[PDB]
C-alpha cells in the first residue's frame, strides 16, 4: 500500500513537474496584458490562463502527501507548499 510514494518519487515526476512549472510561469505571467479592457481575445486568454492555473493547482495538490504526516516538521524548504 506504500508503493504510491515510490510511484510519486519515480516515473520521472520531477522532470514533468519542472516542465509544468516553467510553462505556467512563462505563460500565466509574461502574457498578462496589464493595461486592457475586458476585450474578446484578451478575455478568452485570461479565462484560459485561469483554467490552466486551476488545473495546475489541482495537479500539485494531488501530487502531494509523499511522506505523509512527516514533512510538516522536517521542512527546511518544503514550507513553500504553504
DSSP string computed for 22-34: HHHHIIIIIS---
31 in Cβ contact with 45 (< 8 Å): yes
For the chain, after which residues does the C atom lie more than 2.5 Å from the next written residue's N, i.e. where is it broken? none
Resolution of this entry, Å: 3.1
User: How many other CB atoms are there within 10 angstroms of residue 45's CB atom?
Assistant: 16
SS3 of residue 44 by DSSP: helix
Q: How far apart are CA 3 and CA 62, in angstroms?
A: 16
Angle 13-25/41-62 helices, nearest 10 degrees?
A: 150
Q: How far apart are CA 2 and CA 5, in angstroms?
A: 6
Look at residues 22, 24, 9 and name the one whose alpha carbon lies nearest to residue 55. Answer: 24
The experimental method is cryo-EM
Grid cell listed for 7: 510511484
Amino acid at each position: 500500500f506504500r508503493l504510491q510514494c515510490h510511484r510519486i518519487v519515480n516515473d520521472t515526476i520531477f522532470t514533468n513537474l519542472i516542465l509544468f512549472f516553467i510553462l505556467l510561469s512563462s505563460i500565466s505571467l509574461a502574457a498578462e496584458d496589464p493595461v486592457q479592457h475586458t476585450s474578446f481575445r484578451n478575455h478568452i486568454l485570461g479565462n484560459a490562463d485561469y483554467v490552466f492555473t486551476s488545473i495546475f493547482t489541482l495537479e500539485i495538490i494531488l501530487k502531494m502527501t509523499a511522506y505523509g504526516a512527516f514533512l510538516h516538521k522536517g521542512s527546511f524548504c518544503r514550507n513553500y507548499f504553504n
